[PDB]
């Protein structure tokens, strides 16, 4: 169990469904949470989760594996309550997302896909991002944050363990399910 790692987004983060809805990534969750009100499990630790797979929706996702982009269905999404600074990573194309300091990302290692945390991607390290039907680099330009004291929210894309999400268009990192990738299940 790590000290840092276990991240989420900001309640006004785009998401970009299959079909490109532009809504918020709070808002999306809480329909869910406000439809399926007697279906919000709490954790012990006491998140907040429930299963959408039943809705079946696509996200434009993609998968590691050849670095592509692919539709994929979410299987269950979580939300927090958090006041804190968020990291606001810009790039070139004015890209920017709205996360935590400790958030796994991925980067150029001059040729190769690195993951690092987000605070560590500052003005001299290459932020990868997507592009039409492929991956790319940007450059950082600008590193600063926001003050936020709103809620949180994350997935379960645990089926390549990568999405979208962000603001313009988004970044393409890493997604989970419970923990550094365990999966527990038969």
């Known amino acids: ?9 900001a309640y006004d983060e785009p998401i970009y469904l299959s079909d ?4 918020n990534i709070g808002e999306f969750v809480d329909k869910f ?5 007697n279906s919000i499990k709490k954790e012990d630790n006491g998140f907040g989760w ?3 797979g ?3 929706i696509y996200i434009k996702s993609f998968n590691k594996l050849s670095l592509i982009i692919e539709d994929k269905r979410i299987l269950r999404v979580w939300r927090k309550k958090y006041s804190g600074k968020l990291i606001k990573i810009t790039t070139k194309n004015r890209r920017e997302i709205t996360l935590t300091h400790d958030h796994p990302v991925y980067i150029s290692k001059t040729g190769e896909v690195l993951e690092i945390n987000a605070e560590m991607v500052k003005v001299g390290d290459y932020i990868y991002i997507p592009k039409n039907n492929t991956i790319n680099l940007d450059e ?3 590193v600063e ?4 004291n709103g ?11 990568t999405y979208i999400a962000g603001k313009n268009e988004g970044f393409a990192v890493s997604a989970s399910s419970g923990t550094l990738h365990h999966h527990h299940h038969h």
Do not use: Q, S
Not at 20 to 23: A, E, L, P, R, V
Not at 33 to 37: D, E, G, N, R
Not at 145 to 148: A, K, L, Q
């Open 1 to 9: 169990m790590n000290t840092g790692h276990d991240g989420a987004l």
């Open 54 to 56: 039943n809705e079946n």
């Open 50 to 52: 429930i299963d959408i």
């Open 140 to 142: 950082v330009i600008k």
């Open 145 to 148: 944050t926001v003050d936020y």
């Open 20 to 23: 490109g809805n532009i809504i």
């Open 33 to 37: 949470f406000k439809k399926y009100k």
């Open 151 to 161: 809620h949180i929210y994350d997935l379960t894309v645990e089926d390549n363990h």
